[PDB]
């Protein structure tokens, strides 16, 4: 080619500026444009254009937005990074009781794809409840709690534990209370009110997809033709052709082929003496 | 043999070999950014990127610039003569992490203080060596002295 003394001294024949670091973003600074200060995927957000100098001073870590996200993650105003599970307990034997309490919903705000239909047994919501309660009970321990619930109580299904949260607890109070830590229960109640919820949101999502709402996996609408139940090209619904239907035979303009024996309409030329 | 093969099913990724067919200086600042994240700037440069998801977008945005080629991993373990049993997460567990141009730190200064200290932990490696000779001779000069009086 035309390499000339050094990395970044390639082609040197086009008149672009080498040594210019094209990868780096433009310093848009004061200029007002939707393209300001935005990673290219955020260009569609024309409702919060990031123009202006202060956005240049703070995306870039300039004068006094030098630690800009003045409250980034890794601070909690509320619980200050200490787990809210009481260890100061009356009896040391029962200190392990409080382990596994829900600090928030844990199940609805995340939005996992619980593919469990609401009629499965309870023992099939254990793989979900665990992922938030490890460090509290071994996975194979839950399957001892999430079975004594199915055996002892009258509850069997994820739909039941969502419709009988009162009848379940009252069982636990008067029958459990020594083995099953109620941490499981309020966890068991938080999933069973989600698996039941999502199945309502799935069963509806499948029931519109027939009525013709047709949204993609990422749920954006996609418009697409329905399936055929009758003839594709309309016959009794056809719009008239739209061009004056002076047929090719009323004015034999072109595209017409006739046998030479069967030549028509020469009533004065060569049909007067027909053959 | 008219049957879905039956056996413990291993899955093998893909490895894209990417080259650069169009000049980078004609394109945008974002398209140049993707090429930079594929270790590609000059025309004719060539890199071997994995088929992991966030690479699939980077390559996608710049499809009109590169010429990709896909290799299943078994079709890579043979492109370089490799025994089938040796995986790649043990081959890499052998090369040092300080390969040519070790890191890509956030600016050519932080680069030049990542290479500096790397050229320091060499100095300290000989200096932690030269006193470890003295600290053992000193702990012996103590015992020779101590046991001298006995």
């Amino acid at each position: 080619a035309s390499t000339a003394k050094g990395y970044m001294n390639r082609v040197m024949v086009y008149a672009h500026r080498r040594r210019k670091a094209r990868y780096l973003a433009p310093k848009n600074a004061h200029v007002r444009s939707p393209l300001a200060h935005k990673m290219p995927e955020e260009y569609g957000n024309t409702w919060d254009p990031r123009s202006g100098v202060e956005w240049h001073n703070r995306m870039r870590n300039r004068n006094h937005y030098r630690h800009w996200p003045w409250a980034r993650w890794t601070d909690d105003p509320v619980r200050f990074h200490q787990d809210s599970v009481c260890h100061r307990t009356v009896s040391a034997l029962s200190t392990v009781a409080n382990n596994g309490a829900p600090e928030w919903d844990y199940y609805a705000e995340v939005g996992q794809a619980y593919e469990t239909p609401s009629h499965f047994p309870l023992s099939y919501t254990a793989p979900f409840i665990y992922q938030y309660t490890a460090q509290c009970w071994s996975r194979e321990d839950l399957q001892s709690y999430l079975e004594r619930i199915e055996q002892s109580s009258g509850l069997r299904t994820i739909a039941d534990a969502a419709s009988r949260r009162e009848a379940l607890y009252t069982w636990w109070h008067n029958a459990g209370m020594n083995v099953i830590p109620l941490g499981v229960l309020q966890h068991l109640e938080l999933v069973s009110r989600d698996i039941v919820a999502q199945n309502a949101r799935k069963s509806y999502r499948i029931e519109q997809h027939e009525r013709g709402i047709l949204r993609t996996p990422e749920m954006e609408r996609y418009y697409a033709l329905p399936h055929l139940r009758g003839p594709s090209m309309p016959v009794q619904l056809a719009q008239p052709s739209g061009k004056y239907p002076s047929g090719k035979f009323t004015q034999m303009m072109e595209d017409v082929a006739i046998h030479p024996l069967q030549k028509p309409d020469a009533r004065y030329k060569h049909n007067m003496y027909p053959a | 043999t008219t049957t879905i093969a039956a056996g413990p099913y291993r899955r093998v990724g893909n490895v894209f070999i990417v080259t650069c067919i169009d000049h980078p200086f004609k394109f945008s600042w974002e398209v140049n950014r993707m090429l930079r994240e594929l270790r590609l700037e000059f025309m004719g440069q060539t890199t071997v990127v994995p088929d992991i998801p966030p690479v699939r977008k980077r390559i996608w945005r710049v499809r009109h610039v590169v010429r990709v080629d896909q290799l299943d991993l078994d079709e890579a373990k043979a492109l370089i003569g490799i025994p089938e049993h040796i995986s790649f997460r043990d081959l890499a567990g052998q090369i040092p992490p300080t390969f040519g141009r070790g890191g890509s730190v956030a600016n050519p200064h932080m680069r030049s203080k990542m290479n500096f200290m790397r050229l320091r932990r060499m100095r300290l490696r000989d200096v932690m060596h030269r006193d470890q000779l003295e600290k053992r001779l000193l702990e012996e000069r103590h015992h020779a002295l101590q046991q001298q009086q006995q």
Partner: peptide, 6 residues
């Protein structure tokens, strides 16, 4: 201009 050594 940060190099790549590719």
């Amino acid at each position: 201009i940060t190099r790549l050594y590719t």
